[PDB]
Amino acid sequence: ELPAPVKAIEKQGITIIKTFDAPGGMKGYLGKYQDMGVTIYLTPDGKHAISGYMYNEKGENLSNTLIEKEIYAPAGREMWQRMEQSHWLLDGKKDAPVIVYVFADPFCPYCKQFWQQARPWVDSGKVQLRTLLVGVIKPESPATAAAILASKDPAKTWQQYEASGGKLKLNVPANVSTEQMKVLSDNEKLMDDLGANVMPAIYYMSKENTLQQAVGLPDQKTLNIIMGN
Amino acid sequence: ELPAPVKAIEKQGITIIKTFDAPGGMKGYLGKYQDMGVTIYLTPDGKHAISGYMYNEKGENLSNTLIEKEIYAPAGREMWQRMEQSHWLLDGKKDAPVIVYVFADPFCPYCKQFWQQARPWVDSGKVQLRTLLVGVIKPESPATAAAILASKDPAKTWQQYEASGGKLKLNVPANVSTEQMKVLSDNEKLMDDLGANVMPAIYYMSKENTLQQAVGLPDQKTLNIIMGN
């Protein structure tokens, strides 16, 4: 069973997940208090335990680094991977290092403003926006989205559409093809599974690779963080 | 100079106060982040440091225990000692273990209600209230306070006064004697030095002996905590 010191911390409202190896002849215990990840360290004497953050000589917070790869990083890879597997529209270089997925609607004003805010990073080749289109906001939203997906170079059309503030003229097909309807229905389902209703719904990866989310028009700060700044 | 791990925590906004002996072959460092006391523990390897709370086998938070006797407990003993040295009115047994100082005014409604709330503990012999009178609220406040201090058994008179909701009749002296005026002026100065303007201003000691303060009419909880419950 658990060492007494660690059991006393467990009584202060913590639930242990597992144990890990800590430096100095110390055992580590990974736990949680409600949503928060917590690291406990049993002292060599085996008689004391420290609930806190371990830092190394370079200043890296090892406790936060770990609490991220073990509690946070994981659950949102199926999601980053489910986005990669959808039929997204490319905006920028395909070799661009920073990847940002965005759920957009043809009739969403903020989708356009965010698109403008990102020009610099996209153009520099540092960031590529991968748009997952949906048609949920207006009556003509599915028709317009389908039309954009019907165009000869969808990605280009979408870029022009956003650049022209939604005033870019389109050719309307007699009907939404089945494959287009599927891309729209599948993207709509993924977006729903993400709890993302207001658009633009922005998804990106942190410096430590955990699934981040931005909804609506980002402010300067959230914008630089999304773009890899 | 400081071990690198501890220096990295210092850069995260902490100011070290001193070092102390920690169990397990670990050095401890007592510090502060703004107002908050913090304990850092250098690992045996001398290469890692943990900013957090140390618990022992019995569940005692050693870090909080210490951060209290070293950062909190101290500054308010001159104050607990300055109160003891003032001419306070006794209400209860002089051997009562729990001591509560209260700054009261003859014309303060809440002073009366708090006085009623405390009857039980006082009567049981567990708590003694030591009243430091002042005359600051009303025009006739100094006259009434002085009169209460002029009475033959001031403490008793004060108790009756509070019990009778301020309706206890008093004998008004021709003048506030010099010693009475001094007790009132001295208590007024101490109260001011304490930042205590609204009354009743209640002062008591915690389980770990640090100077606590309650202002106004306490709720059931603050009331039980003040009374040693």
Alpha carbon A191 to chain centroid distance? 12
Give the Cα separation of B130 and B121 in Å (integer). Answer: 13
Q: Are strands A98-104 and A211-215 parallel, antiparallel or unpaired?
A: unpaired
User: Could you give the CA distance from residue A221 to residue A129 in angstroms, rounded to a whole number?
Assistant: 18
- How many other C-beta atoms lie within 10 A of the C-beta of residue B95? 7
Across B82-217, the runs of DSSP E, i.e. the strands, are 89-91, 98-104, 127-133, 201-205, 211-215
Query: Which helix or strand (DSSP H or E) is residue B48 part of?
Result: strand B48-56
Sign of CA dihedral A68, A70, A72, A74: positive
Question: A52–B56: do the CB atoms touch at under 8 Å?
Answer: no
Contact A128, A90 (CB under 8 A): yes
User: How long is chain B?
Assistant: 229
Minimal Cβ distance to B11: which of A45, A48, A59: A59
Query: How far apart, in whole angstroms, are the C-alpha atoms of residue B165 and residue B107?
Result: 10
Final resolution, Å: 2.3
How was this structure determined? It was done by X-ray
What contacts A78, CB < 8 A, 6 or more positions away? Answer: none
Contact B43, B50 (CB under 8 A): yes
For residue A72, give the 3-state DSSP assignment: helix
Q: What are phi and psi of A213, to 5 degrees?
A: -140, 140
Name which of B25, B48, B56 is nearest A54 (Cβ-Cβ): B48
Say which DSSP state B61 is in. B
**Gaps in chain A after residue (C–N beyond 2.5 Å):** none
Which of B37, B51, B44, B67 has the alpha carbon at shortest distance from B7?
B51
Question: What whole-number distance in Å separates Cα of residue A134 and Cα of residue A114?
Answer: 17
Q: How far apart are CA B89 and CA A114, in angstroms?
A: 70
Other C-beta atoms closer than 10 Å to the C-beta of B217 total 16
Structure tokens that stand for A66 in this block: 């770990």
List the single best residue of B10, B39, B43, B53 to mutate versus A (max A Cβ within 10 A).
Answer: B43
Task: Sheet containing B36-42: give its strands across.
Answer: A15-22, A26-33, A36-42, A48-56, B48-56, B36-42, B26-33, B15-22
CA A53 to chain centre: 26
The rounded distance, in Å, linking the Cα atoms of A58 and B120 is 59
**B33 and chain A in contact, CB less than 8 A:** no
Confirm or reject contact between A59 and chain B (CB < 8 A): yes
The answer to whether the CB atoms of A50 and B56 lie below 8 A apart is no
Q: For residue B12, what is the nearest residue in chain A, using CA coordinates?
A: A59
* Nearest C-alpha in A relative to B44: A24
| Angle at CA of residue B78, ends B72 and B82, nearest 5° | 135
Maximum Cα interatomic distance, chain A, rounded to a whole number of Å: 77
Please return the burial class of B46, using the count of CB atoms within 10 Å of its CB with bins 0-12, 13-18 and 19+: middle
Domains within chain B, CATH numbers bracketed: 1-71 (3.10.450.70), 72-229 (3.40.30.10)
